[PDB]
Amino acid sequence: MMWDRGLGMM
Amino acid sequence: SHSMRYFFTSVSRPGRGEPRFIAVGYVDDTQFVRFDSDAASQRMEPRAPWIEQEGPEYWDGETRKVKAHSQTHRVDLGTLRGYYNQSEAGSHTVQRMYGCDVGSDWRFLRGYHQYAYDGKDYIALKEDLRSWTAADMAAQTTKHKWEAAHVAEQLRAYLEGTCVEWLRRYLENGKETLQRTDAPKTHMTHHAVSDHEATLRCWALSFYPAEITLTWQRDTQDTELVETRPAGDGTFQKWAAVVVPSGQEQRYTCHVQHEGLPKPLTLRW
Amino acid sequence: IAGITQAPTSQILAAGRRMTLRCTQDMRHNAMYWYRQDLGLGLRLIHYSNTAGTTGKGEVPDGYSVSRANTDDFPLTLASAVPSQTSVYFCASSLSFGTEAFFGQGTRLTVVEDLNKVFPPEVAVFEPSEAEISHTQKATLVCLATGFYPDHVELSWWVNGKEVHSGVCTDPQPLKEQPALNDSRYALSSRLRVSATFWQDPRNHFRCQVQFYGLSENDEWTQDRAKPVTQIVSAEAWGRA
Amino acid sequence: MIQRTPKIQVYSRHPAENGKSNFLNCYVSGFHPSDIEVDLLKNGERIEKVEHSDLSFSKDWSFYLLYYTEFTPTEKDEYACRVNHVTLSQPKIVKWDRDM
Amino acid sequence: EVEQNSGPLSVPEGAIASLNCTYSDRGSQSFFWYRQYSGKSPELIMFIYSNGDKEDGRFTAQLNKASQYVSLLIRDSQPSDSATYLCAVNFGGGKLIFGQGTELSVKPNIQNPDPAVYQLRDSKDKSVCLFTDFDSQTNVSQSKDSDVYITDKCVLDMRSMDFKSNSAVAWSNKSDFACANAFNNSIIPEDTFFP
């Protein structure tokens, strides 16, 4: 199961 | 002893159309989910028979996450293009990988989380799961933003918690696939090259997992070793070859190490 | 003060009318949410947006649409309001999906079949009983707001021109004067308790003020009775020996 | 940008036996960027019903893909894999070597 | 979904309050406790995403994902802890789902209860009945008469006198109404003073 958080270079 | 990994690839395609995003999930060397932004379903999809028993809440949830990631990586591509002063006409790639390893007791062993830009390291979570390594100075900007948002704390909780727990679940649900160990089928072939030169090829077929080592022994780091390749049925193949000097001075031997073998095999012509 | 704000704070809406609730944030949050809150149901998710440029359906999306063209805004549109959409609406945002959500002020929205059912409150102040004074040496004043619809009211007590909070207690929710009627009018009560000697001083002034949120300036009104717009209705009582 | 040129292996899933159904594989690995063109050939001509795996990559970030098709090998039927990639000025053809 | 008891729950002022929340989705990875006062918006108390306890002043959250519950502990309950406590659970990809909320009511001990029902006259023919000065465990019910109105009980605090008192009001448009019959449907103390 994938991590439940968005994440980007913001 | 076991691992779960997610692999994400984002590609800008300025001359062709919208960006492409592909996500795949693996347990060890067995892929079990995929998402392709170019496909018609627009949903995360099963690729192993043991994941198909997960209910619709699982598939809806993973679809929601991967769809968000697809959108967000489009922003990342634009941000990184700005950081590196690159033109809008070129195609560029962002890759992300993360996951966890468990030991033979299925307890947490280590976690991973890394990004690459155009196939080169960009930023990576350190082994202690508490701080980041930026590959160049451009990536320090991203490091500082992630540190200010305490990303590592939430990520460490995932890698040591949810990642490990669901890996155990998959290992039990798919034990007939994931906990198996198919031993290599090994044989050797000889082919004449010249009148006073030949080549011996040490084969290894139908083994799982992909981890294997093939080494030649006259009694040699000047040989050919092809990448381990999938047979297509969930097992793997690999070979190694020596260029023997004489047509009969060929007293070499190859050793095959694999967890499906109690003791390393020895092959001779 | 980078925060999240909703607008408007309250709204009365005739059935069949279009309406958009605004919600903006300058925290550069990537995820935003819309909830409605009703008795016995808590907060129910209407729509969410896990990233700028996308939206998704919640638990109860029917009759509502949203858009997220920009990071900042997340407007909630009711294309054709129906009475079941009467509710309190809360917008929220988080830095990313999976992180903590912060909420806006809330929007109290009532959808009515016809604006002719909107009524402002009547306000009366009931003076303390002489028995209470000689039995407890205290004096309780009761404020009663009655006959208002919808229930968007705020009650406050003013003593000698100054708002007070000590010795004040107000019903959390107004009650229905005719529970069988779905468009029933409401009543709200509050108490202010003071010393017996303080109430007995003829110099002390007491006033209950009821803020009623009603129709606005952009509403047409052709009925007989006066238009029930947002207004303050008050009642008074002076001390007496 | 630093490109990686694909390594190409053409092989069968099972030991090749004339007249027995098998799978012809073309494995391309170690390449970058991911855009790649792969065809399987039968006597120099394109095979239409060719499947491929989902794009993934290795620890060094280089991509790998498996292209595969069902076939029955015979004595005189020649098969090959034809690969085009930005690192290649023209498509590179690798012949299936049954005795490799 | 996400399940909490609706309440209302009583806790004596100064005592420990405990709140529980269960959830169905094994995949859920973050959990939140919110406090909401009446007519106000939810305010975050505490988030938690790892199994175990998490302490924040008088508050302790406990998470057991294997058992699919999250709990909140409030020590030394104060009057400002009276509120609805909302459990929220992330189901993946932004689907943040709240429970129905548990209303908590911190009950002060009435020093000297003197239950009595008074009749108050308007400054201007109409009147209301005031039931006041009862203990915090008294329950004020609604009348079976459709034309009689009774509010819920409510505690006021005269801060300078260090005094607190519960009250409820009743009234009716009819004139059969006498304050003796106003609270017959409620369990009233037998020594209630009727002037």
PDB file of N, CA, C and O in Angstrom, chain B residues 194-239:
ATOM      1  N   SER B 194      37.549 -19.712 -32.903  1.00  0.00           N
ATOM      2  CA  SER B 194      38.596 -19.834 -33.906  1.00  0.00           C
ATOM      3  C   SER B 194      39.176 -21.245 -33.855  1.00  0.00           C
ATOM      4  O   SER B 194      38.676 -22.121 -33.144  1.00  0.00           O
ATOM      5  N   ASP B 195      40.246 -21.460 -34.621  1.00  0.00           N
ATOM      6  CA  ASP B 195      40.910 -22.756 -34.615  1.00  0.00           C
ATOM      7  C   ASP B 195      41.626 -23.027 -33.301  1.00  0.00           C
ATOM      8  O   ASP B 195      41.854 -24.194 -32.961  1.00  0.00           O
ATOM      9  N   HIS B 196      41.975 -21.983 -32.553  1.00  0.00           N
ATOM     10  CA  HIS B 196      42.684 -22.127 -31.289  1.00  0.00           C
ATOM     11  C   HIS B 196      42.088 -21.200 -30.237  1.00  0.00           C
ATOM     12  O   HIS B 196      42.811 -20.561 -29.469  1.00  0.00           O
ATOM     13  N   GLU B 197      40.758 -21.115 -30.194  1.00  0.00           N
ATOM     14  CA  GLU B 197      40.052 -20.291 -29.220  1.00  0.00           C
ATOM     15  C   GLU B 197      38.595 -20.729 -29.176  1.00  0.00           C
ATOM     16  O   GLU B 197      38.015 -21.069 -30.210  1.00  0.00           O
ATOM     17  N   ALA B 198      38.011 -20.716 -27.978  1.00  0.00           N
ATOM     18  CA  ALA B 198      36.629 -21.139 -27.791  1.00  0.00           C
ATOM     19  C   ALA B 198      36.011 -20.331 -26.657  1.00  0.00           C
ATOM     20  O   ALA B 198      36.673 -19.511 -26.014  1.00  0.00           O
ATOM     21  N   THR B 199      34.722 -20.569 -26.412  1.00  0.00           N
ATOM     22  CA  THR B 199      33.990 -19.854 -25.374  1.00  0.00           C
ATOM     23  C   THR B 199      33.062 -20.813 -24.644  1.00  0.00           C
ATOM     24  O   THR B 199      32.352 -21.602 -25.276  1.00  0.00           O
ATOM     25  N   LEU B 200      33.085 -20.751 -23.315  1.00  0.00           N
ATOM     26  CA  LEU B 200      32.218 -21.552 -22.462  1.00  0.00           C
ATOM     27  C   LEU B 200      31.195 -20.637 -21.806  1.00  0.00           C
ATOM     28  O   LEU B 200      31.563 -19.618 -21.214  1.00  0.00           O
ATOM     29  N   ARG B 201      29.920 -20.999 -21.913  1.00  0.00           N
ATOM     30  CA  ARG B 201      28.828 -20.195 -21.375  1.00  0.00           C
ATOM     31  C   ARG B 201      28.136 -20.968 -20.259  1.00  0.00           C
ATOM     32  O   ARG B 201      27.652 -22.084 -20.474  1.00  0.00           O
ATOM     33  N   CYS B 202      28.093 -20.367 -19.073  1.00  0.00           N
ATOM     34  CA  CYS B 202      27.480 -20.955 -17.888  1.00  0.00           C
ATOM     35  C   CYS B 202      26.068 -20.391 -17.755  1.00  0.00           C
ATOM     36  O   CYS B 202      25.896 -19.199 -17.493  1.00  0.00           O
ATOM     37  N   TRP B 203      25.063 -21.244 -17.933  1.00  0.00           N
ATOM     38  CA  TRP B 203      23.674 -20.810 -17.921  1.00  0.00           C
ATOM     39  C   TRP B 203      23.042 -20.995 -16.544  1.00  0.00           C
ATOM     40  O   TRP B 203      23.531 -21.747 -15.700  1.00  0.00           O
ATOM     41  N   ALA B 204      21.933 -20.289 -16.333  1.00  0.00           N
ATOM     42  CA  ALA B 204      21.116 -20.449 -15.132  1.00  0.00           C
ATOM     43  C   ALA B 204      19.707 -20.008 -15.484  1.00  0.00           C
ATOM     44  O   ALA B 204      19.504 -18.848 -15.851  1.00  0.00           O
ATOM     45  N   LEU B 205      18.742 -20.917 -15.381  1.00  0.00           N
ATOM     46  CA  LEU B 205      17.396 -20.668 -15.878  1.00  0.00           C
ATOM     47  C   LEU B 205      16.349 -21.005 -14.826  1.00  0.00           C
ATOM     48  O   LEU B 205      16.574 -21.830 -13.935  1.00  0.00           O
ATOM     49  N   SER B 206      15.192 -20.345 -14.950  1.00  0.00           N
ATOM     50  CA  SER B 206      13.987 -20.654 -14.174  1.00  0.00           C
ATOM     51  C   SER B 206      14.226 -20.556 -12.667  1.00  0.00           C
ATOM     52  O   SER B 206      13.840 -21.437 -11.897  1.00  0.00           O
ATOM     53  N   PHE B 207      14.847 -19.462 -12.236  1.00  0.00           N
ATOM     54  CA  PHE B 207      15.087 -19.257 -10.817  1.00  0.00           C
ATOM     55  C   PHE B 207      14.337 -18.030 -10.321  1.00  0.00           C
ATOM     56  O   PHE B 207      14.033 -17.109 -11.086  1.00  0.00           O
ATOM     57  N   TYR B 208      14.023 -18.050  -9.029  1.00  0.00           N
ATOM     58  CA  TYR B 208      13.398 -16.942  -8.326  1.00  0.00           C
ATOM     59  C   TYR B 208      13.844 -17.004  -6.869  1.00  0.00           C
ATOM     60  O   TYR B 208      13.896 -18.087  -6.290  1.00  0.00           O
ATOM     61  N   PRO B 209      14.166 -15.849  -6.265  1.00  0.00           N
ATOM     62  CA  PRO B 209      14.137 -14.501  -6.842  1.00  0.00           C
ATOM     63  C   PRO B 209      15.302 -14.214  -7.785  1.00  0.00           C
ATOM     64  O   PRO B 209      16.117 -15.098  -8.051  1.00  0.00           O
ATOM     65  N   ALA B 210      15.364 -12.972  -8.277  1.00  0.00           N
ATOM     66  CA  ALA B 210      16.328 -12.609  -9.306  1.00  0.00           C
ATOM     67  C   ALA B 210      17.758 -12.549  -8.785  1.00  0.00           C
ATOM     68  O   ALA B 210      18.697 -12.647  -9.582  1.00  0.00           O
ATOM     69  N   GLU B 211      17.943 -12.384  -7.479  1.00  0.00           N
ATOM     70  CA  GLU B 211      19.281 -12.299  -6.907  1.00  0.00           C
ATOM     71  C   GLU B 211      20.056 -13.582  -7.172  1.00  0.00           C
ATOM     72  O   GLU B 211      19.624 -14.669  -6.776  1.00  0.00           O
ATOM     73  N   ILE B 212      21.198 -13.456  -7.844  1.00  0.00           N
ATOM     74  CA  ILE B 212      22.034 -14.607  -8.172  1.00  0.00           C
ATOM     75  C   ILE B 212      23.429 -14.093  -8.483  1.00  0.00           C
ATOM     76  O   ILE B 212      23.608 -12.934  -8.867  1.00  0.00           O
ATOM     77  N   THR B 213      24.427 -14.954  -8.302  1.00  0.00           N
ATOM     78  CA  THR B 213      25.808 -14.612  -8.616  1.00  0.00           C
ATOM     79  C   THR B 213      26.430 -15.740  -9.421  1.00  0.00           C
ATOM     80  O   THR B 213      26.335 -16.910  -9.036  1.00  0.00           O
ATOM     81  N   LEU B 214      27.056 -15.382 -10.538  1.00  0.00           N
ATOM     82  CA  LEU B 214      27.732 -16.327 -11.416  1.00  0.00           C
ATOM     83  C   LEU B 214      29.181 -15.887 -11.549  1.00  0.00           C
ATOM     84  O   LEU B 214      29.451 -14.762 -11.984  1.00  0.00           O
ATOM     85  N   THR B 215      30.108 -16.759 -11.160  1.00  0.00           N
ATOM     86  CA  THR B 215      31.530 -16.449 -11.202  1.00  0.00           C
ATOM     87  C   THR B 215      32.291 -17.608 -11.825  1.00  0.00           C
ATOM     88  O   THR B 215      32.020 -18.774 -11.525  1.00  0.00           O
ATOM     89  N   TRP B 216      33.244 -17.281 -12.691  1.00  0.00           N
ATOM     90  CA  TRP B 216      34.083 -18.282 -13.328  1.00  0.00           C
ATOM     91  C   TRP B 216      35.374 -18.475 -12.544  1.00  0.00           C
ATOM     92  O   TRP B 216      35.921 -17.535 -11.961  1.00  0.00           O
ATOM     93  N   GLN B 217      35.863 -19.712 -12.550  1.00  0.00           N
ATOM     94  CA  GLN B 217      37.016 -20.096 -11.740  1.00  0.00           C
ATOM     95  C   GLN B 217      37.909 -20.993 -12.589  1.00  0.00           C
ATOM     96  O   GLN B 217      37.573 -22.156 -12.830  1.00  0.00           O
ATOM     97  N   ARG B 218      39.036 -20.451 -13.056  1.00  0.00           N
ATOM     98  CA  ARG B 218      40.098 -21.322 -13.546  1.00  0.00           C
ATOM     99  C   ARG B 218      40.824 -21.967 -12.373  1.00  0.00           C
ATOM    100  O   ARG B 218      41.057 -23.182 -12.365  1.00  0.00           O
ATOM    101  N   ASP B 219      41.185 -21.155 -11.378  1.00  0.00           N
ATOM    102  CA  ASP B 219      41.567 -21.595 -10.035  1.00  0.00           C
ATOM    103  C   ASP B 219      41.855 -20.385  -9.153  1.00  0.00           C
ATOM    104  O   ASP B 219      41.797 -19.244  -9.610  1.00  0.00           O
ATOM    105  N   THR B 220      38.481 -14.763 -12.228  1.00  0.00           N
ATOM    106  CA  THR B 220      38.750 -14.132 -13.516  1.00  0.00           C
ATOM    107  C   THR B 220      37.822 -12.945 -13.760  1.00  0.00           C
ATOM    108  O   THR B 220      36.624 -13.117 -13.985  1.00  0.00           O
ATOM    109  N   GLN B 221      38.383 -11.741 -13.715  1.00  0.00           N
ATOM    110  CA  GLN B 221      37.622 -10.516 -13.960  1.00  0.00           C
ATOM    111  C   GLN B 221      37.924  -9.971 -15.355  1.00  0.00           C
ATOM    112  O   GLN B 221      38.393  -8.848 -15.539  1.00  0.00           O
ATOM    113  N   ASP B 222      37.646 -10.811 -16.345  1.00  0.00           N
ATOM    114  CA  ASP B 222      37.824 -10.454 -17.748  1.00  0.00           C
ATOM    115  C   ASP B 222      36.825 -11.257 -18.579  1.00  0.00           C
ATOM    116  O   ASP B 222      37.183 -11.940 -19.541  1.00  0.00           O
ATOM    117  N   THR B 223      35.550 -11.190 -18.198  1.00  0.00           N
ATOM    118  CA  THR B 223      34.520 -12.049 -18.760  1.00  0.00           C
ATOM    119  C   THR B 223      33.269 -11.232 -19.047  1.00  0.00           C
ATOM    120  O   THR B 223      33.159 -10.062 -18.670  1.00  0.00           O
ATOM    121  N   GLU B 224      32.312 -11.874 -19.713  1.00  0.00           N
ATOM    122  CA  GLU B 224      31.052 -11.247 -20.086  1.00  0.00           C
ATOM    123  C   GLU B 224      29.947 -11.739 -19.160  1.00  0.00           C
ATOM    124  O   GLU B 224      29.810 -12.945 -18.934  1.00  0.00           O
ATOM    125  N   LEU B 225      29.160 -10.803 -18.632  1.00  0.00           N
ATOM    126  CA  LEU B 225      28.093 -11.116 -17.686  1.00  0.00           C
ATOM    127  C   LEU B 225      26.871 -10.292 -18.069  1.00  0.00           C
ATOM    128  O   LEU B 225      26.841  -9.080 -17.832  1.00  0.00           O
ATOM    129  N   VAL B 226      25.861 -10.937 -18.652  1.00  0.00           N
ATOM    130  CA  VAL B 226      24.673 -10.200 -19.069  1.00  0.00           C
ATOM    131  C   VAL B 226      23.751  -9.976 -17.876  1.00  0.00           C
ATOM    132  O   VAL B 226      23.769 -10.712 -16.885  1.00  0.00           O
ATOM    133  N   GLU B 227      22.930  -8.935 -17.988  1.00  0.00           N
ATOM    134  CA  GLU B 227      21.982  -8.606 -16.937  1.00  0.00           C
ATOM    135  C   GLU B 227      20.995  -9.747 -16.729  1.00  0.00           C
ATOM    136  O   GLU B 227      20.592 -10.427 -17.678  1.00  0.00           O
ATOM    137  N   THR B 228      20.620  -9.961 -15.472  1.00  0.00           N
ATOM    138  CA  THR B 228      19.556 -10.902 -15.158  1.00  0.00           C
ATOM    139  C   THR B 228      18.278 -10.484 -15.875  1.00  0.00           C
ATOM    140  O   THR B 228      17.871  -9.320 -15.812  1.00  0.00           O
ATOM    141  N   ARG B 229      17.655 -11.432 -16.569  1.00  0.00           N
ATOM    142  CA  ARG B 229      16.525 -11.107 -17.423  1.00  0.00           C
ATOM    143  C   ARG B 229      15.308 -11.954 -17.059  1.00  0.00           C
ATOM    144  O   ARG B 229      15.451 -13.109 -16.652  1.00  0.00           O
ATOM    145  N   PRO B 230      14.102 -11.407 -17.194  1.00  0.00           N
ATOM    146  CA  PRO B 230      12.901 -12.180 -16.859  1.00  0.00           C
ATOM    147  C   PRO B 230      12.528 -13.142 -17.977  1.00  0.00           C
ATOM    148  O   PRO B 230      12.569 -12.799 -19.161  1.00  0.00           O
ATOM    149  N   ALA B 231      12.168 -14.366 -17.591  1.00  0.00           N
ATOM    150  CA  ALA B 231      11.700 -15.326 -18.583  1.00  0.00           C
ATOM    151  C   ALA B 231      10.308 -14.971 -19.083  1.00  0.00           C
ATOM    152  O   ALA B 231       9.947 -15.322 -20.212  1.00  0.00           O
ATOM    153  N   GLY B 232       9.522 -14.274 -18.269  1.00  0.00           N
ATOM    154  CA  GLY B 232       8.160 -13.914 -18.607  1.00  0.00           C
ATOM    155  C   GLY B 232       7.114 -14.661 -17.813  1.00  0.00           C
ATOM    156  O   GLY B 232       5.941 -14.266 -17.837  1.00  0.00           O
ATOM    157  N   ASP B 233       7.502 -15.725 -17.110  1.00  0.00           N
ATOM    158  CA  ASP B 233       6.598 -16.504 -16.275  1.00  0.00           C
ATOM    159  C   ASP B 233       6.894 -16.334 -14.792  1.00  0.00           C
ATOM    160  O   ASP B 233       6.542 -17.204 -13.992  1.00  0.00           O
ATOM    161  N   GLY B 234       7.555 -15.245 -14.411  1.00  0.00           N
ATOM    162  CA  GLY B 234       7.866 -14.992 -13.021  1.00  0.00           C
ATOM    163  C   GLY B 234       9.180 -15.562 -12.532  1.00  0.00           C
ATOM    164  O   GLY B 234       9.466 -15.462 -11.334  1.00  0.00           O
ATOM    165  N   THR B 235       9.975 -16.171 -13.404  1.00  0.00           N
ATOM    166  CA  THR B 235      11.326 -16.608 -13.078  1.00  0.00           C
ATOM    167  C   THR B 235      12.322 -15.796 -13.900  1.00  0.00           C
ATOM    168  O   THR B 235      11.942 -14.961 -14.727  1.00  0.00           O
ATOM    169  N   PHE B 236      13.609 -16.047 -13.673  1.00  0.00           N
ATOM    170  CA  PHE B 236      14.656 -15.230 -14.265  1.00  0.00           C
ATOM    171  C   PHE B 236      15.747 -16.105 -14.867  1.00  0.00           C
ATOM    172  O   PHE B 236      15.848 -17.301 -14.580  1.00  0.00           O
ATOM    173  N   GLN B 237      16.551 -15.490 -15.735  1.00  0.00           N
ATOM    174  CA  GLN B 237      17.640 -16.161 -16.431  1.00  0.00           C
ATOM    175  C   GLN B 237      18.878 -15.278 -16.384  1.00  0.00           C
ATOM    176  O   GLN B 237      18.780 -14.050 -16.298  1.00  0.00           O
ATOM    177  N   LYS B 238      20.046 -15.915 -16.452  1.00  0.00           N
ATOM    178  CA  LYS B 238      21.314 -15.199 -16.495  1.00  0.00           C
ATOM    179  C   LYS B 238      22.389 -16.155 -16.985  1.00  0.00           C
ATOM    180  O   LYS B 238      22.297 -17.365 -16.768  1.00  0.00           O
ATOM    181  N   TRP B 239      23.404 -15.606 -17.657  1.00  0.00           N
ATOM    182  CA  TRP B 239      24.558 -16.405 -18.043  1.00  0.00           C
ATOM    183  C   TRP B 239      25.835 -15.583 -17.943  1.00  0.00           C
ATOM    184  O   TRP B 239      25.811 -14.355 -17.825  1.00  0.00           O
TER     185      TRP B 239
END
